[PDB]
Amino acid sequence: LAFQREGFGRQSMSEKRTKQ
Amino acid sequence: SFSLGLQDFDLLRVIGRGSYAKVLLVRLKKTDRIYAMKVVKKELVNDDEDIDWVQTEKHVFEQASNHPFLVGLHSCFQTESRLFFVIEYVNGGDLMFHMQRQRKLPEEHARFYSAEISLALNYLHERGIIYRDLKLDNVLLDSEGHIKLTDYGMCKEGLRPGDTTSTFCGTPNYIAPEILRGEDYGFSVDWWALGVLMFEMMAGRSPFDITEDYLFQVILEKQIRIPRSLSVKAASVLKSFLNKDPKERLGCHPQTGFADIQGHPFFRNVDWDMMEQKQVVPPFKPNISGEFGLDNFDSQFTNEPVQLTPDDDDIVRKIDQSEFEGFEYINPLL
Ligand SMILES: [K+]
Ligand SMILES: [Mg+2]
Ligand SMILES: [Mg+2]
Numbered sequence: 472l473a474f475q476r477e478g479f480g481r482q483s484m485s486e487k488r489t490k491q
Numbered sequence: 492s493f494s495l496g497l498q499d500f501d502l503l504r505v506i507g508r509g510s511y512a513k514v515l516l517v518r519l520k521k522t523d524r525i526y527a528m529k530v531v532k533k534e535l536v537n538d539d540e541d542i543d544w545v546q547t548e549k550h551v552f553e554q555a556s557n558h559p560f561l562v563g564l565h566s567c568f569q570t571e572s573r574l575f576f577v578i579e580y581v582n583g584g585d586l587m588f589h590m591q592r593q594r595k596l597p598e599e600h601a602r603f604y605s606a607e608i609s610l611a612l613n614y615l616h617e618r619g620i621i622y623r624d625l626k627l628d629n630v631l632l633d634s635e636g637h638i639k640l641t642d643y644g645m646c647k648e649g650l651r652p653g654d655t656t657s658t659f660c661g662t663p664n665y666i667a668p669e670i671l672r673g674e675d676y677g678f679s680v681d682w683w684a685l686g687v688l689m690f691e692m693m694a695g696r697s698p699f700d701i702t703e704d705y706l707f708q709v710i711l712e713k714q715i716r717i718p719r720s721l722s723v724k725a726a727s728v729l730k731s732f733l734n735k736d737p738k739e740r741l742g743c744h745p746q747t748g749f750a751d752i753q754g755h756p757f758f759r760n761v762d763w764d765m766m767e768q769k770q771v772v773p774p775f776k777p778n779i780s781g782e783f784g785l786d787n788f789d790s791q792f793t794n795e796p797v798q799l800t801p802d803d804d805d806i807v808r809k810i811d812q813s814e815f816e817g818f819e820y821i822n823p824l825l
């Protein structure tokens with residue numbers, strides 16, 4: 472509810488790192 | 492060869508995942524010692540920028556061995572499809588899991604955790620490293636209740652005290668305004684992220700709770716108002732870390748920065764030198780239950796099949812294997 476692991480806005484990202 | 496390999500380990504359990512890696516609980520067979528194992532797929536390593544972050548993560552991991560509140564490295568090795576970091580296992584679970592179970596922490600507990608995180612960050616900064624991914628999931632609790640930061644893949648290394656960089660990166664909830672505005676930035680973005688995390692611990696929710704375009708807009712525009720039940724000193728420290736101007740934000744002045752943190756009224760009861768020696772007893776003691784303390788890890792991970800995902804041979808056979816030459820490492824201090 473309050474905190475969702477990997478939920479909206481909670482995923483790490485980078486313009487210089489390939490994801491997925 | 493001195494180096495260890497995958498066949499030197501027993502795979503016990505999956506304990507975590509993020510955007511870039513899978514993390515397993517492992518046993519080093521010859522010593523019967525337990526470690527965590529971070530696994531990165533080589534197919535994700537496309538360009539030089541991907542090689543950069545892997546090499547940076549390894550190097551910060553190496554330096555981490557010198558500080559009590561950073562996760563240290565035992566060994567590194569690779570297979571055809573993957574890169575492996577064997578690192579110390581911290582079995583109290585992470586602060587994301589802690590917050591889900593506790594809902595909200597007393598000011599004393601947040602003070603303790605934030606002071607230990609502050610010392611970890613300062614150690615990195617002193618050494619020219621911006622951390623760049625502080626979040627609840629990346630702060631681990633050890634058996635005794637002290638913390639350790641993990642996950643060094645977002646780090647920028649090699650910055651002299653006044654230097655800046657400009658990569659758009661981080662976790663959206665925690666990303667500083669100067670990044671979102673496209674400015675060159677320094678160590679300031681870590682202090683902002685700590686402000687967010689502290690608000691999370693003491694209020695039980697993100698201060699920016701609410702498409703990511705909208706979240707970015709909120710971060711850039713909202714002025715945070717502190718819940719009235721928090722003390723003046725707790726309110727003061729949150730507002731100062733969450734200053735949208737990096738030149739005025741607590742901890743960010745190039746001369747007085749870390750001193751300003753140490754001397755803030757919120758941190759008055761902290762003996763910083765004793766703390767950095769783990770001579771302050773933590774306010775909470777983790778319960779180590781289930782095999783290896785695995786009850787402190789989300790069951791969505793610990794219920795996963797204990798496996799490395801089968802390779803696509805067609806993809807693997809095209810991988811340039813020379814770009815990871817000399818990746819093999821063993822920590823000579825055991
Ligand atoms: K360490
Ligand atoms: Mg890239
Ligand atoms: Mg992570």
